[PDB]
Design a protein around this ligand. Structure first.
Ligand SMILES: [Zn+2]
Ligand SMILES: [Zn+2]
Lengths: 266, 264
């Protein structure tokens, strides 16, 4: 399946040219952004750090369908439509395949850190985008330095709203917020996190994305309930099962106390 | 029973009987990435800062285990504040009290943790290199508090050439006592995925140097699994070559994790 999906990714609009320099047949995926770059641009992405871009080679690196969710629903042309909307037809400062590293660095930093080339927008817009399942409007809000930390009027936190209203088609929007929003742990007045909301609204695929994003497991809301409590009480069995495993560290890779080291150390 | 022991140990660290940020008695909220304890009001401001800055969990109310406690056991409010509040005067400074209004409390914590406005000023690659080798958690904290980019390679004593990325060095020289340094840099440095000239990531280094605890921390931190260095080797390849059995098993589990639990 991953082979079938990778082939699909590479056919997305704009995906036969590096997102940042137009080099033919990019094989480097920014998994949190859903774009493809050449080897030179990918190195620059990597050097931004994990907050901005997480680079894996389609060809060389271990990938599964989850890493491909955004890439299957973004693509270079879509992403650039928002993120290079200020750029002139002739490219301006955008590098080409043979550009020197200094130019290539300066451009990628401007494009992804400062968002220099992105469409400008300036709340109700964001609520509507989320309910519309408009991944590109969510990208635009992020490109305007938006707080996915600030409540939305339709009172609902951005990630909470995305999770509540999620269907299969809108999963990319949820994944995009989890990976790029500042505020995975935000509570909301009654103490519910996005994980509590995924339990409450029976959103097991959201739960998988939150857990993958390292959402906090086993915290309580103002009522004293965990996401697991809510799932059990609602008969949301698929959610309970995921939350039982999370609480048990089905991964998380827990460190253990080394008794020997403790004794030899006091 | 075991977590209970560690939580009592955390609460007994110097300065942990009072909130890190306002002095309120008996703080029960832990910033897990920083290893400090705050009161209820200051915890809400921390959480509002965002995951990048602080992740808050209740020692009393929320599920916790050894992994989330590692930094707490080794930091504590006094240690932390010796660095992060070094610039404050003895009296009449901006540090809130238990009774302070939320605007006051929010401005201070922002300045303290985002601006690092109050932290001991220190100019420094050699400094940080020696800290890591000396398992000096507080100097790592000091470097962080002065805007040090853990993304920039460090040059060693002299000997040369291995310039080392900060996390790489910390993993390479790690022992059981230095794990909190590794965890601090993983959670708070910008650069978990950094490579280094031969293509090795910190995960590759943890397999290379037989550091299975650093490996769990890297994986907890969501290190990329299954990527190749310039020789075409994954961390798992390297663990198998060196016969590092615990590393191989951890990485086999991680690779298998990539394909669980699939979306509908
Ligand atoms: Zn390129
Ligand atoms: Zn406080």
């Amino acid at each position: 399946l991953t082979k079938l999906l990778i082939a699909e990714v590479k056919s997305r609009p704009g995906n036969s040219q590096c997102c940042d320099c137009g080099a033919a047949d990019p094989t480097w995926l920014s998994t949190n952004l859903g774009v493809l770059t050449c080897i030179q641009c990918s190195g620059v992405h990597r050097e931004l750090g994990v907050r901005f871009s997480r680079m894996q080679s389609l060809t060389l690196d271990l990938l599964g369908p989850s890493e491909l969710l955004l890439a299957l629903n973004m693509g270079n042309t879509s992403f650039n439509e928002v993120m290079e909307a200020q750029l002139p037809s002739h490219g301006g400062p955008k590098p080409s395949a043979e550009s020197d590293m200094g130019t290539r660095r300066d451009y990628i930093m401007a494009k992804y850190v400062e968002h220099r080339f992105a469409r400008r927008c300036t709340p109700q817009r964001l609520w509507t985008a989320i309910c519309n399942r408009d991944l590109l409007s969510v990208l635009e809000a992020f490109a305007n330095g938006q707080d996915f930390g600030q409540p939305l009027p339709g009172e609902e936190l951005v990630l909470h709203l995305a999770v509540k209203v999620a269907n299969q088609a809108s999963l990319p929007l949820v994944d995009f917020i989890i990976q790029n929003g500042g505020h995975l742990d935000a509570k909301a007045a009654d103490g519910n996190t996005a994980l509590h909301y995924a339990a409450l609204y029976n959103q097991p695929d959201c739960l998988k994305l939150l857990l993958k994003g390292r959402a906090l497991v086993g915290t309580v809301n103002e009522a004293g309930e965990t996401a697991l409590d809510i799932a059990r009480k609602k008969h949301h069995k698929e959610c309970e099962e995921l939350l039982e495993q999370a609480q048990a560290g089905t991964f998380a890779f827990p460190l253990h106390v080394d008794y020997s080291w403790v004794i030899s150390t006091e």
